[PDB]
């Protein structure tokens, strides 16, 4: 029956609780008595990137630990040169609506979308010399919120219509598709072993996915309010969230729970991007405070606090080979902090 | 520097075009067309001549961008942040209807980015408003008007309840009845343009 | 389809002037240098022009430096050079080439076919080769080497030196660029490599389309070697 169902579904919520409950016999605070923290991390400027006139909302560092993509309200997807500042691209956008960019692990690739429910997938080494559209992944209906590139020639998209998405570039089919969420899917977070990722979404919910079949393995519902950021452990087997909570909280793929909650009496406004160290030691992550605090994500308390932009810090990343972390701001000044 | 001279030319050549293309769309204005479902917007965009459907149109030497952000179903709370900066809301609204608009707009121009931006309400289809105040009273829609079923009365006690939902007495809200008729909605957005790049003007020179 | 077809070329009497051109098509001509080498019927290759995207800078070689002039008609997508005052050495064959300089970028991807220029008769960094001719056969291995008279690594980390593979009645291409990168196209049998100031360039596992000459040219600031030809 219809009502039975719907009584089991509960039935069946709060026993998985009860054994997640059940496998809590500790928490990670107490354990991490047994070390000493990392002190004040006072990263400081490197560099500034004032090349964009408006909000660069997203950014991603290429394998090199070289070069960045920015997207921008400006309708520019200029990629960077980290040391000689130089704008070594500048992509005109088909719609100047970006909240996402990506930078494909061979460096070949670049892609970004948004507002108009298309995925535009640039080919940087063509032989005309110009970066030009590889090919525009229509198929979605809300807009797009993240892109990750697994490799040269699949894609896994998040969207704001609650379903991520897997294609193949080849023909540009949705090859696969996903679902399981019920708010607007915001952010997206590939693991290091290309096998799985988790998204964020509006419905406060994290969720893990199987790339190479659209069924969700483990669901996280640590946070109250819509999942802002997300970002995968560099080991792969746990992951932070950072939401409008004003906290950011880590998960472990494998206990199935929440295991901090980064979050102070002083700070109020909502996270809006979030990634790991190369170690995993500590947690960058962006608030709307303007300006970007670093978590300790073993001892939970704040390292530090890195300013420097007029507005939010839309988006942050550390590098690959973890040189170094830069944060794009609606300032528009792309900051390389180390 | 070794032949990477020749890069950091590139380079400059990159910012020169990026500060082209700046000063070139910066010359243009930006209008969010954001309004209730079937309020004839598709209308007041012809009259003038999957996402977001930027479409344009130019009069008297200025080039109006007018998005239509209601092509896509989300909520407005996730992505109407990109839409900051915009010198102006072409709220429209269908008298048809109802209080659902009314919702939109009180969460629109009491929005936290919204906080200093016009908005030029437009009151569409006023004829098949009067046709229906000829045959059915207003009250029916709005239990609490006391007027009777008259046109313009009628028209002025649903404009203002529009209005009133302003809690901020900085901006202001141009609301003006179009009843189908042609050149004279491109003519009040062009007059509101004006007035808030004239207000725009005065405040970077301070005299704000 | 990258086109650089080149035209102009004839007989000049000594002391006059020609304006040898380059046409292109097929590829964004404003965004790409341009250089206008050239080769002797009995030598190796040789710079002549050099003019940058946009053109920002303009280099020539001391041999031409205010004897010839290049311009380049972006709308036309085509690139001239101005010889004046023609002399018994100009009688070469002239390439024109592109180049993007960017981070991961290649310089010279493309040489145009090139056209025969002749004239009736009447403080530097130099690259040296140590061989003239190495006798190969199919399935073999091969070792090409060069020298200059300085280190080429900038500061840096680059190393500004190239390997370019002309076969005989054709025009070049380029093989490795920054002494360790492969071009597109190039086969995997092409691996260069080296340091310091000894730099060697190998073409393991020798296909029959190997057979040519290997100019290996520096780029560190404003030139190729002699040149070997493997013989099969």
């Known amino acids: 029956e219809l009502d039975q169902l719907r009584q089991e579904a509960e039935q069946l919520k709060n026993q998985i609780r009860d054994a997640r409950k059940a496998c809590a016999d500790a928490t990670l605070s107490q354990i991490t008595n047994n070390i000493d923290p990392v002190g004040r991390i006072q990263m400081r400027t490197r560099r500034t990137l004032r090349g964009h006139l408006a909000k660069i909302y997203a950014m991603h560092w290429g394998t090199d630990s070289r070069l960045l993509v920015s997207a921008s309200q400006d309708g520019k997807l200029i990629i960077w040169d980290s040391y000689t500042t130089n704008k070594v691209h500048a992509i005109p956008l088909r719609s100047s609506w970006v909240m996402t960019c990506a930078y494909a692990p061979s460096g070949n690739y670049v892609a970004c979308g948004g507002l108009d429910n298309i995925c535009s997938i640039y080919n940087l080494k063509t032989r005309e010399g110009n970066v030009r559209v590889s090919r525009e992944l229509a198929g979605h209906t809300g807009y797009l919120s993240c892109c990750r590139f697994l490799d040269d020639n699949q894609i896994v998209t998040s969207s704001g219509d609650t379903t991520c998405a897997l294609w193949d570039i080849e023909t540009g089919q949705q090859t696969t598709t996903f679902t399981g969420h019920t708010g607007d899917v915001m952010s997206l977070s590939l693991a290091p072993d290309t096998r799985l990722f988790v998204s964020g979404a509006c419905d406060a919910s994290a969720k893990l996915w199987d790339v190479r079949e659209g069924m969700c393995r483990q669901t996280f519902t640590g946070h109250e309010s819509d999942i802002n950021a997300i970002c995968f452990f560099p080991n792969g087997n746990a992951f932070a969230t950072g939401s409008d909570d004003a906290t950011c909280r880590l998960f472990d793929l494998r206990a199935d729970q929440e295991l901090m909650t980064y979050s102070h009496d002083n700070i109020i406004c909502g996270i809006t991007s979030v990634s790991f160290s190369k170690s995993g030691r500590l947690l960058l992550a962006g608030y709307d405070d303007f300006n970007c605090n670093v978590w300790d994500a073993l001892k939970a308390d704040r390292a530090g606090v890195l300013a420097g932009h007029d507005n939010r810090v839309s988006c942050l990343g550390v590098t690959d080979d973890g040189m170094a972390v830069a944060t794009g701001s609606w300032d528009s000044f792309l900051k390389i902090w180390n | 520097s070794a032949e990477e001279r020749a890069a950091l030319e590139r380079s400059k050549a990159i910012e020169k075009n990026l500060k082209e293309d700046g000063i070139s769309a910066a010359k243009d204005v930006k209008l969010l067309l954001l309004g209730a479902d079937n309020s004839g917007k598709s209308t007041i965009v012809k009259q003038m001549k999957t996402g977001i459907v930027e479409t344009h149109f130019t009069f008297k030497n200025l080039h109006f961008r007018l998005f239509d952000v209601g092509g896509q179903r989300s909520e407005r709370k996730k992505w109407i942040h990109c839409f900051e900066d915009v010198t102006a809301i072409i709220f429209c609204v269908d008298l048809s209807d109802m209080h659902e608009s009314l919702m939109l707009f009180d969460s629109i121009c009491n929005n936290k980015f919204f906080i200093d931006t016009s908005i030029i309400l437009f009151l569409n289809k006023k004829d098949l408003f009067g046709e229906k105040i000829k045959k059915s009273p207003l009250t029916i829609c709005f239990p609490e008007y006391t007027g009777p079923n008259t046109y313009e009365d009628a028209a002025a006690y649903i404009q203002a309840q529009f209005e009133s939902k302003n809690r901020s007495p900085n901006k202001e809200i141009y609301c003006h009845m179009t009843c189908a008729t042609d050149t004279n909605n491109a003519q009040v957005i062009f007059d509101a343009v004006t007035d808030i790049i004239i207000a725009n003007n005065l405040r970077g020179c301070g005299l704000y | 389809d990258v086109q650089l077809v080149e035209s102009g070329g004839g007989l000049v009497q000594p002391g006059g002037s020609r304006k040898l051109s380059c046409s292109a098509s097929g590829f964004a001509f404003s965004s790409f240098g341009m250089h206008w080498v050239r080769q002797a019927p009995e030598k190796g290759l040789e710079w002549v022009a050099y003019?940058?995207?946009?053109?920002?800078?303009?280099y020539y070689a001391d041999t031409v430096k205010g004897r010839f002039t290049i311009s380049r008609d972006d709308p036309k997508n085509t690139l001239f050079l101005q010889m004046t005052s023609l002399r018994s050495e100009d009688t070469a064959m002239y390439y024109c080439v592109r180049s993007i300089y960017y981070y991961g970028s290649s310089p010279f991807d493309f040489w145009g076919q090139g056209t025969t220029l002749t004239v009736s008769s009447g403080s530097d960094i130099v690259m040296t080769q140590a061989t003239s001719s190495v006798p190969v056969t199919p399935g073999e291995s091969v070792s090409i080497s060069c020298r200059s008279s300085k280190s080429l690594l900038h500061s840096n980390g680059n190393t500004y030196l190239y390997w370019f593979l002309q076969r005989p009645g054709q025009s070049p291409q380029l093989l490795i660029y920054?002494?360790?990168n492969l071009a597109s196209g190039v086969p995997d049998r092409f691996s260069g490599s080296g340091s310091g100031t000894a730099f060697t360039l190998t073409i393991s596992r020798l296909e029959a389309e190997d057979v040519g000459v290997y100019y290996c040219?520096?780029?560190?600031?404003?030139?190729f070697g002699a040149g070997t030809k493997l013989e099969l």
């Open positions: 920054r002494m360790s």
């Open positions: 003019i940058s995207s946009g053109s920002g800078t303009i």
């Open positions: 040219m520096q780029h560190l600031e404003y030139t």
